[PDB]
Amino acid sequence: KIAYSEIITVGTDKDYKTISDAIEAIRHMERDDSQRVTIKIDPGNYQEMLIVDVDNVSLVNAAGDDASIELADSGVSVSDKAVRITSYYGHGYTYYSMGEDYRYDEEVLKVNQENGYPSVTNPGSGTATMWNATVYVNADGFEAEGIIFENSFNQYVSELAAEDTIVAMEGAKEGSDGTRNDLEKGSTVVQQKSYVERASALALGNNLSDIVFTNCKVVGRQDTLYGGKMTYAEFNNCEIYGAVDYIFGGMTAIFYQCELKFNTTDNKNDVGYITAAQQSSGRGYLMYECHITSVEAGTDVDSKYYSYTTSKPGYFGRPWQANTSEVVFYNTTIDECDSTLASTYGSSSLIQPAGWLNSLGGEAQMYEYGTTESSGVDNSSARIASWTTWTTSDSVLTTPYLADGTKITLDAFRKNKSG
Ligand SMILES: [Mg+2]
Ligand SMILES: [Mg+2]
Ligand SMILES: [Mg+2]
Ligand SMILES: [N+]
Ligand code: NA
Ligand code: NA
Ligand code: NA
């Protein structure tokens, strides 16, 4: 056991050299679980996977109010005032670096590369690996400020990925620019739809409380951000990036004044769906005064595959749990789509007129109140026109009240301490 420290630092001459090392130190502290530990991280690029299994821990950028969450170099780099926590496993591949707990281990890598075979087969999607999440939060009271969480699987070939041995397995998706193992460091060819599969940046476990992200960014494509059932999490002034089902799971979440950025390519089938909610009961997601928008070429993504001023139009979501899942879009501002893509895909709005799809789990309690369309269109009458049990008039609210009478407020989506 080591002493309690309320604040510990990460950086080349700080308390700890890696974020992993700092979390491991917290596991050894003589502290009550109620005593918070803040990990104050120097700006830098941290090629690490983390399991946060310690209560009341914060990850914060040492740059404070002057933190950046900007990407650079077509996704490959970050601002010098950014803290990026990144890793690269995704569905369909096994990795010589992967250890028994499904996380990267440099010592396992060395053994496996000497042996000529991996030691652990990647399950891929699902809760065994948390969709290969970079950061898996499995504790109460977790907070983060000014951090970029990323899975690079469909963003770029990282240093560590290029040095790993990556094995295509069941479900591997690849296009025509080389197999994943053969790509060199810095390649962005993995942004293409033909290489896309599920790879989470950030996953929250189930039954967790008091999780809050502030001024963070979460970077991925398919299944970027997961949160489990009965977890309360808030994302305040964050940026969430993705394509298919990029915010998913059964958490009771608030996205307060977030940028919701479609991270898609020119490929005609590369369409985004913001939410894929999976509640069996109770409250779902509250998207409160968010901005539906797009990534930018040269900072976030490679212009080779992103040729227009916006993403093509996408959708608010596709419910994963039938009937009982819940998402509320409240006071959303929706970009106008690039005029060329608007014509091609039949939508001036960056959200398709139908709004939602039944193509995952079915219909469920998907709501919209107070939309501003920057294009000036009014697609209210078109929303979910093909749905039969949750219909347009259930979804498109004229007053800010849900079907059970609940007023749409932040507090409606926070934990009720008496149960
Ligand atoms: Mg890779
Ligand atoms: Mg597949
Ligand atoms: Mg309305
Ligand atoms: N940026
Ligand atoms: Na860890
Ligand atoms: Na799987
Ligand atoms: Na790298």
Numbering used by the authors: 9 to 427
Passage from the reporting paper:
Pectin methylesterases (PMEs, EC 3.1.1.11, classified in the Carbohydrate Esterase family 8 [CE8]) are crucial enzymes that modulate the physicochemical properties and digestibility of plant cell wall components. PmeC5 is a large modular enzyme that is characteristic of rumen B. fibrisolvens megaplasmids and plays a central role in degrading plant cell wall components and releasing methanol in the rumen environment.
Here we present the crystal structure of the catalytic domain of PmeC5 that is associated with a gene from Butyrivibrio fibrisolvens D1T that encodes a large secreted pectinesterase family protein (2089 aa) determined to a resolution of 1.33 Å. Molecular replacement was carried out using an AlphaFold2 model of PmeC5, with the structures producing near identical secondary structural arrangement (0.388 Å RMSD). The structure of PmeC5 was the characteristic right-handed parallel β-helical topology and active site residues of Asp231, Asp253, and Arg326 typical of the enzyme class. The N-terminal region of PmeC5 is composed of a short α-helix (α1) followed by a β-strand that aligns with and helps form the 10-turn parallel β-sheet, and the C-terminus comprises a single long loop (residues 378–423) containing two short α-helices (α2; residues 399–403, α3; residues 418–421). The overall structure of PmeC5 is maintained by an internal aligned core of hydrophobic amino acids (Ile16, Ile47, Leu67, Phe150/Ala152, Phe221, Phe243, Phe263, Met295, and Phe337) placed at equivalent positions on neighboring β-strands throughout its helical topology. The catalytic triad consisting of an arginine and two aspartic acid residues is strictly conserved amongst PMEs and is formed by Asp231, Asp253, and Arg326 in PmeC5. The structure of this catalytic domain reveals a right-handed β-helical structure with relatively simple loops forming the walls of the active site to create a relatively shallow catalytic groove when compared with other PME enzymes.
